[PDB]
C-alpha cells in the first residue's frame, strides 16, 4: 500500500498472509470462516503455500501467529487471466483457524448490496509502500 | 515490502468515472477505488477492500490490479465480491 499507514495490531482480524514455504509474503487474503480463506486468483496459490493468521509484524518472533495448511485451491472457473476478470480463489484450510481477538471473519455482502461511488472504504496489506 | 500491516482509506469510484482512466479494461466483476493519494501495490493482491455497512465491515473488493507503477493518481481495480458471492456460497456448500 503506497502511502498507507501502519494498522493497529489485530484490528483487521481477517487479514491473512500467503507465504511460500520459504517464508516469503506474496499475497494477502481474508478469512470468511475458520476453514476458508478468500484470495485473488492471480496470486497462484498452491497447496505448498501457507496461510498465516494473527500476524501483524512479519519480522517478529514473539507473535502468536497461526500457520495453517491448504487442503485445496479453488480457482473460479470464470476467472479470465487475460482480462483479469473474476479474480477470486477460495482456499480450503486442512487445519481450521482458531478464532480469537486477533483472528475472526469478515462479512460477505448479498449480491444485491449497494456500495455507492464516493463511499470511503479501507484496504489493508503488506504490499510495497513505495515503488 | 513492509514488516507491519498497513491500511489506507480510499474512495470507491463509479465504473463510468473509472473507464475514464481504464477505458474498456473495466469489466462488470470489477470495482474501482483510490486515485486519491494512495494505491494498492505488489504484495497486496488477494487482500481486502472493506466498507462498513450497518456497523460491520463487509468485503466489497479483492485487490486485483491497477497501475504498474502503483500511481496514487490512478484508481486501483478490485474483484467485485457482490458479483462473485454466489459462487463463494455454492463452493462452501458443495465442499
Amino acid at each position: 500500500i503506497v502511502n498507507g499507514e501502519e494498522a493497529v495490531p489485530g484490528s483487521w482480524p481477517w487479514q491473512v498472509s500467503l507465504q511460500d514455504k520459504t517464508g516469503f509474503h506474496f499475497c494477502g487474503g481474508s478469512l470468511i470462516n475458520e476453514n476458508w480463506v478468500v484470495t485473488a486468483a492471480h496470486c497462484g496459490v498452491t497447496t505448498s503455500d501457507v496461510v498465516v493468521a494473527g500476524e501483524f509484524d512479519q519480522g517478529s518472533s514473539s507473535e502468536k501467529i497461526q500457520k495453517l495448511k491448504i487442503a485445496k485451491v479453488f480457482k473460479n472457473s470464470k476467472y479470465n487471466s487475460l482480462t483479469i476478470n473474476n479474480d477470486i480463489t477460495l482456499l480450503k484450510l486442512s487445519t481450521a483457524a482458531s478464532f480469537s481477538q486477533t483472528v475472526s471473519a469478515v462479512c460477505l455482502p448479498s449480491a444485491s448490496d449497494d456500495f455507492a461511488a464516493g463511499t470511503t472504504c479501507v484496504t489493508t496489506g503488506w504490499g510495497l509502500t513505495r515503488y | 515490502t513492509p514488516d507491519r500491516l498497513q491500511q489506507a482509506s480510499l474512495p470507491l469510484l463509479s465504473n463510468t468515472n473509472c473507464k475514464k482512466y481504464w477505458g474498456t479494461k473495466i469489466k462488470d466483476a470489477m470495482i474501482c477505488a483510490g486515485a486519491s493519494g494512495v494505491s494498492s501495490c505488489m504484495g497486496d493482491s488477494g487482500g481486502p477492500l472493506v466498507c462498513k455497512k450497518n456497523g460491520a465491515w463487509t468485503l466489497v473488493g479483492i485487490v486485483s490490479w491497477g497501475s504498474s507503477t502503483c500511481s496514487t493518481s490512478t484508481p486501483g481495480v478490485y474483484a467485485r465480491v457482490t458479483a462473485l458471492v454466489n459462487w463463494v456460497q455454492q463452493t462452501l456448500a458443495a465442499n
Binding site: 494498522a7 493497529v8 495490531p9 489485530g10 484490528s11 483487521w12 482480524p13 480469537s100 481477538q101 486477533t102 475472526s104 471473519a105 469478515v106 462479512c107 460477505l108 479501507v122 | 491500511q7 482509506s9 472493506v50 462498513k52 455497512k53 456497523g55 460491520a56 465491515w57 463487509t58
Partner: peptide, 10 residues
C-alpha cells in the same frame, strides 16, 4: 462477522 475485537483506528 465484520466486527473486530480490537477496533481499527483510521
Amino acid at each position: 462477522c465484520g466486527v473486530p475485537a480490537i477496533q481499527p483506528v483510521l
